[PDB]
RNA sequence: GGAGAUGGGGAGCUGUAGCGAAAGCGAGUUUUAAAAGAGCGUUUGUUUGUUAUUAUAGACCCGAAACGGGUUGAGCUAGUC
């Protein structure tokens, strides 16, 4: 695509830099990324809870 | 590795050829003298998520009389001294 460089000024680089079209895909998935998201909200979790 | 997602890690797990008690044979095979007949086979996978049911753990909850083991008590009462 056009994805562009940024100098430290904020203002733009002249020269934007193309893309390999491999990463950029045709086919998205909506399902793994849901459950991407739910298996790392968890894994957060100590669980030190206890009762007796 | 941020008490991380994940990366490495193929050792194993299931499926890919069944049949037979077994050696064995093999899209055939066991029984059988039989290459007939019949039985069984002649491809539809796997890993997770979630839910229902189920197994071993008290396994919906409450409820015994009891069983066993260790200790405490003869300052009432029974006996003896």
């Known amino acids: 695509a056009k994805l562009?460089?940024?100098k430290i000024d904020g203002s733009f680089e002249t020269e934007p830099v193309?893309?390999?079209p491999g990463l950029?895909?045709?086919?998205?998935?909506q399902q793994p990324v849901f459950?991407?998201?739910?298996?790392?909200?968890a894994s957060?979790?100590?669980?030190?809870?206890?009762?007796l």
Do not use: M
């Open 18 to 20: 193309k893309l390999s």
């Open 24 to 29: 950029i895909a045709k086919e998205l998935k």
């Open 4 to 6: 562009k460089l940024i």
């Open 35 to 41: 459950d991407a998201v739910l298996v790392e909200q």
């Open 44 to 51: 957060w979790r100590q669980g030190t809870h206890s009762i």
